Design a protein around this nucleic acid. Structure first.
Ligand SMILES: [Mg+2]
Ligand SMILES: [Mg+2]
Ligand SMILES: [Mg+2]
Ligand SMILES: [Mg+2]
Lengths: 214, 218
RNA sequence: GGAAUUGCGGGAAAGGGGUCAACAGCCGUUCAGUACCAAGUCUCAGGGGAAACUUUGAGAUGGCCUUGCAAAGGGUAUGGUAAUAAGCUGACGGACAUGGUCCUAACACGCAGCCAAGUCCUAAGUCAACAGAUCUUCUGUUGAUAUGGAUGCAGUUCA
């Protein structure tokens, strides 16, 4: 089969920067190469076909070129809405094959997370489980550490986190971390705290609450 | 608007069968080839089968050949992918995509929205929805706990509230069940006047849950 | 002395000029429709030729993806159309800011025309070698040979 090797697997670039993504075909594919943009959870969107033809609905800042078996997608002035995974595809011989994808993220000024903590609902707690959620809202860059402490006891193994994909207007992320405790364990302890470390924060920020109707 | 409308995926047990449909709207199926591309959760695009615009030349990936069968209904402007003897390797979002007839070197111009096929013995379970109560901007949300399979989608105030909303990727828990949170930031002055309801759709369990989220007390 | 030194297409740098914040322009893997089915290659038939070839008619193939090529691969009338098959018309969709578009246009490329050389085909005519005699004249085979052709990427300038 024909392998399509996509370089940068990931890149971060500022609004206005020229972004270059290359695809090396393992053998000649003439110009039978297409480029797609895929936004998270969405179908891939055709950008370029036959190596250099621009498809309709695509800003003219996207262009494609070929040199031998090397194909280049160029975004000439990156915009915030261009965050996506980009895929090259060859339609020269069966099977049709895609590159492994290049994730593009938009670099912007560092922004610290606004941190919120939410205690378990009383209805969930009566059912035997406590989910404590820590929200880190609108931060950049994506890298952030959340540590949970119950009565200052460092927690491990009982939390999971989820991160949104980059905002198409302000290029920030949001992250939720959920601490899961049994009703028994949750009612034994008083202070629930999530400690956030991020480049936008000169020191780790703690947000906490004390268990109880108060 | 010209489009490809996909349906028919969802949960199936190993060895089970699913039939995906791809209805063309605004372009002619007879002058298209139809391609099936799948993407395992968090992974890349894989081309698995296609039927050329002559409708007779089909290709199938070796691992799919014999189990999968493309057909087309000219009268309904619809293509199908029958997927038999399904196994965990087949779990993925399946896209149908088309290409103009004869344009053999081109990519795919119209794509279906994608359908998740999950091959699992695990049982469907609808979500419990709990408030993340708010306690000059306030964050509030809902926690959608313990559902299977994906997907869940969340809106706020029936799609009327979209600004400031963050719905997080589902997290697979040790239990085998998914959880996700959806949060929205609103003006604190609106908390006593504006009603905030999260609308959670879990079509795999035939369930929609609306949860009004309000201040509690502590 | 005379002939010929050609007709075009899609692009397009620079400077200038018109126009467009979404264009009666431009782009389309969308939909419908109008007109049309080229060149090249091959086969046969009618006309020319010694032949090779040529011209006309019919058919096949070709054409599209593919404007570096297009063998392979796919498509191939449910198809196709640049310069010798509208790359047409309407609608729909789309792109555009020191950007889109149009005029002016260096320039290279491409489609054709004419084609020097070269190559290749043919060998009527002629020549040669051998052979044959019909007595001063001859015919036979084998070969070469264009001045016959086809091909032809050179050249197609200056103003
Ligand atoms: Mg033509
Ligand atoms: Mg063409
Ligand atoms: Mg024409
Ligand atoms: Mg010439």
């Amino acid at each position: 089969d024909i392998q399509m090797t996509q370089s940068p697997s990931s890149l971060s670039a500022s609004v206005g920067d020229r972004v270059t993504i290359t695809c090396r075909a393992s053998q000649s594919v003439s110009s039978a190469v297409a480029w797609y943009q895929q936004k998270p959870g969405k179908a891939p969107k055709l950008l370029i076909y036959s190596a250099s033809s621009l498809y309709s609905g695509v800003p003219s800042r996207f262009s494609g070129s070929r040199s031998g078996t090397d194909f280049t997608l160029t975004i000439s002035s990156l915009q915030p809405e261009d965050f996506a995974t980009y895929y090259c595809q060859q339609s020269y011989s069966s099977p049709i094959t895609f590159g492994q994808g290049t994730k593009v993220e938009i670099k912007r000024t560092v922004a610290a997370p606004s941190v919120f903590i939410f205690p378990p609902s009383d209805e969930q707690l009566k059912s035997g489980t406590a989910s404590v959620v820590c929200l880190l809202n609108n931060f950049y860059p994506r890298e952030a550490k959340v540590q949970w402490k119950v009565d200052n006891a460092l927690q491990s193994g009982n939390s999971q986190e989820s991160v949104t994909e980059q905002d198409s207007k302000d290029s920030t992320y949001s992250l939720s971390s959920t601490l899961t405790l049994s009703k028994a364990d949750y009612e034994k302890h008083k202070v629930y705290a999530c400690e956030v470390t991020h480049q936008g924060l000169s020191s780790p920020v703690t947000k906490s609450f004390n268990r109880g109707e108060c | 608007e010209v489009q490809l409308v996909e349906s028919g995926g969802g949960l199936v047990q190993p060895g089970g069968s699913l039939r995906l449909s791809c209805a063309a709207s605004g372009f002619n199926l007879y002058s298209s080839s139809i391609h099936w591309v799948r993407q395992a959760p968090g992974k890349g695009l894989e081309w698995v089968a296609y039927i050329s615009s002559s409708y007779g030349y089909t290709y199938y990936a070796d691992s799919v050949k014999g189990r999968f069968t493309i057909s087309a209904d000219t009268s309904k402007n619809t293509a199908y992918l029958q997927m038999n003897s399904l196994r965990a390797e087949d779990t993925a979002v399946y896209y149908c995509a088309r290409r103009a007839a004869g344009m053999s070197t081109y990519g795919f111009d119209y794509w279906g929205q994608g359908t998740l096929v999950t091959v699992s013995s695990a049982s469907t379970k609808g979500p419990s929805v709990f408030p993340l109560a708010p306690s000059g901007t306030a964050a509030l949300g809902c926690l959608v706990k313990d559902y299977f399979p994906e997907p869940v989608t969340v809106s706020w105030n029936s799609g009327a509230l979209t600004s400031g909303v963050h719905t997080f990727p589902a997290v697979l828990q040790s239990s085998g069940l998914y959880s996700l949170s959806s949060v929205v930031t609103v003006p604190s002055s609106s908390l006593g006047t504006q009603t905030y309801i999260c609308n959670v759709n879990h079509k795999p369990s035939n369930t929609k849950v609306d949860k009004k989220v309000e201040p509690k007390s502590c």
